Amino acid sequence: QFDLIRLNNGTIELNGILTPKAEVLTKIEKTLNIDELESVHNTFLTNILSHKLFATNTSEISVGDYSGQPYPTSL
Amino acid sequence: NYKLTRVLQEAVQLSSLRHLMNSPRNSSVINGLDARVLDLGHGSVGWDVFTLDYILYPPLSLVLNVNRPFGRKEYLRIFNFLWRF
Amino acid sequence: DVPMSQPLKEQEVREHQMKKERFDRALESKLLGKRHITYANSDISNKELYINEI
Amino acid sequence: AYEIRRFLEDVYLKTLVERLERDFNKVPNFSIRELEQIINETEVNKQMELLYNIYEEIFREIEERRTNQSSQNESSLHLRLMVAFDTTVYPVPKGGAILKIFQQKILENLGDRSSVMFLKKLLNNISQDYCTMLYEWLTQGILNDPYQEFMTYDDLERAWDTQYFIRKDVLLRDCDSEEDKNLLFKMLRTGILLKVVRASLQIPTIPSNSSDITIQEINDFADLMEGSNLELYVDKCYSRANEIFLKLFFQGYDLINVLKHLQQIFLGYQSGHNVLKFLTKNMGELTKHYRNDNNANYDKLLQNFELERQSENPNNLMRQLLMIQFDTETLPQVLSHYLQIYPEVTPKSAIYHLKFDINIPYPLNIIISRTCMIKYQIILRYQLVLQYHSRLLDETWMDLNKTPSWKYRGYSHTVKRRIVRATRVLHAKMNHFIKTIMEYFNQNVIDKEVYSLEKCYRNPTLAVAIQNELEGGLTNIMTN
């Protein structure tokens, strides 16, 4: 349940507020909506194209030493 | 001058006052037991210099007259006389 | 009759507490302090009663 | 101003018309002297003189605050309070700065029971909304302050690292003696804890059944400010706030478990095997280069750590949040910023620069402040240095009893002594010293403070008491 935010400087932190462990004082699925489903699909496709053996055509690429090239170009 | 506090804790532990120091409520009674080092000049001996005291804070310092900073210091001189014995 | 010394147990307790307090104050100072001082740079106004010139 | 206008309309103009004009139109024998007599008898002159005196006092106040522009408490630091004082002296008095004027007037009118009754009814009328705001801040932590009046206010209009301020100018008590500061900070802490409780549960208000200590509304401000009445009122509010806050943390957040995991991470408590594992997997890097060499590729260290964290328990929020870091300052130089020690007298081994930290999530950063987190971090760095040298001497004993080159019986029966026997004797002395220092530390300081803290949250009563025990334990450790 702990949705963590991780930053490029290595610093991480919980996203928002820590909810209590179902604390009760007084006395139904959790599904995904349309924008959430499209975000899930786009996240899948990005995660696949963000993988190092797919990332091409940008400056954010880390290059493989002993070739000096981006891995997908080599492959 | 700094082993004396440990000596006091141990003496309270090695005496009938240990039922008071190790009490769940009345430990504060012995919390006020402190020692004082007199000033009788050079060449003195700890026997005629060491004296016991009792550090009272309000509300009790208002009710119990102990060796107040400007009184007669009755407890101190009585303690000296009995310290001789 | 004599210039006796301050209490002993109380004296050493105070010394220990002063060590702890000095440590805590240095720690706070290193953390830019938990309390500071301010002056107010801006004031409210209401769009029902708005102004621009005299 | 509303009371002034209601006085005029309902008393001054009523007197004027229904007496003066009706006698000027219908009553023979009326005259100017009888006009002044009628004015004096209906008390309209006395009550209007009172209102005008209050107006003149407010006017002199405004004038002072307009001309006196040449102007510029440790308890807020003795407590874990990210709160500042707002020493701004506003152009017009607000709230408490005017209720104080009214109380001063009631004092200056002592003996004129009619003037005292008038001024007391004026105060009870004016301060009703202030009592409402104070009641809300004391029972629900809500700050609805659109006119910048209340004693305290939130900054920042993600949004959880809120900082409170205290408007010194609008305070009800001057905050000079010790009991006034105690009361002021008790009010502030009551509001803060109630806001935390209300923000965690994502609710807009705290139900009145959440505690057995129920608070009534302030229906007489003059009585509340009479004497110790305000102290008891704030005491009840503080008791209810602490009860609810401690219920919430110790049940909905399992703060005992969070402290247990923090002591497992930073103290080593019941977690020696994890530290040993970390060292064995990372024994080579923490001694390399005696430093970070030209921003050395110590990213492999972070990768090892994240790999281990991937195999860590998921329900352990603290180890999920543990961030291994390489600080550019050695442990002694970090300690020199608080204690009377002396720095190195050259690069020095990488474990001396290694450190850890956790961005404690809201609300858990209310009790587990950044000060106790820095204490945890320094303690963990020291414990890591000790356990690291102990692992060094362990693996040294291993190489001295597993390499046949050292077990070999020989060496001229002279070289054997002056080399191997002296080596083993010095190594044994080093091992005994290191292990004894670590034993003393761990089971006479660290264990003592863990046990004290464990004693504290056995049915506690105040959140500030738990914070005080935690910080006192870590201070007893850091000042050891």
From Swiss-Prot, chain A:
Localisation: Nucleus; Cytoplasm, Cytoskeleton, Microtubule organizing center, Spindle pole body
Coiled-coil boundaries: none
Top-level taxon in the UniProt lineage: Eukaryota
Subunit: Interacts with TUB4, SPC72 and SPC97.
Role summary: Involved in microtubule organization by the microtubule organizing center, the spindle pole body (SPB). Probably part of the microtubule attachment site at the SPB.
Annotated family: Belongs to the TUBGCP family.
Note: Present with 56 molecules/cell in log phase SD medium.
Protein name in UniProt: Spindle pole body component SPC98
Organism: Saccharomyces cerevisiae (strain ATCC 204508 / S288c)
Gene that specifies this protein: SPC98
Full-sequence range covered: 678 to 762 of 846
Swiss-Prot record, chain C:
Subcellular location: Nucleus; Cytoplasm, Cytoskeleton, Microtubule organizing center, Spindle pole body
Source organism, top-level taxon: Eukaryota
Other notes: Present with 279 molecules/cell in log phase SD medium.
Subunit structure: Homodimer. Component of the SPC110 complex containing at least CMD1, SPC29 and SCP110. Interacts with SPC97 and SPC98.
Protein family membership: Belongs to the SPC110 family.
Function: Component of the spindle pole body (SPB) required for the proper execution of spindle pole body (SPB) duplication. Potential role in cross-linking filaments or anchoring other molecules. It is essential for growth.
Protein name per Swiss-Prot or TrEMBL: Spindle pole body component 110
UniProt source species: Saccharomyces cerevisiae (strain ATCC 204508 / S288c)
From Swiss-Prot, chain D:
Transmembrane segments: none
Location in the cell: Nucleus; Cytoplasm, Cytoskeleton, Microtubule organizing center, Spindle pole body
Keyword Hydrolase: no
Chief place of localization: nucleus
Swiss-Prot/TrEMBL keywords: Cytoplasm, Cytoskeleton, Microtubule, Nucleus
GO biological process: cytoplasmic microtubule organization; meiotic cell cycle; microtubule nucleation; mitotic cell cycle; regulation of microtubule nucleation; spindle assembly
GO function terms (MF aspect): gamma-tubulin binding
Any one GO CC term of the record: inner plaque of spindle pole body
Role, per record: Involved in microtubule organization by the microtubule organizing center, the spindle pole body (SPB). Probably part of the microtubule attachment site at the SPB.
Additional record remark: Present with 2230 molecules/cell in log phase SD medium.
Subunit structure: Interacts with TUB4, SPC72 and SPC98.
Name this polypeptide is given: Spindle pole body component SPC97
Organism in which the protein naturally occurs: Saccharomyces cerevisiae (strain ATCC 204508 / S288c)
Residues of the full protein shown: 139 to 686 of 823
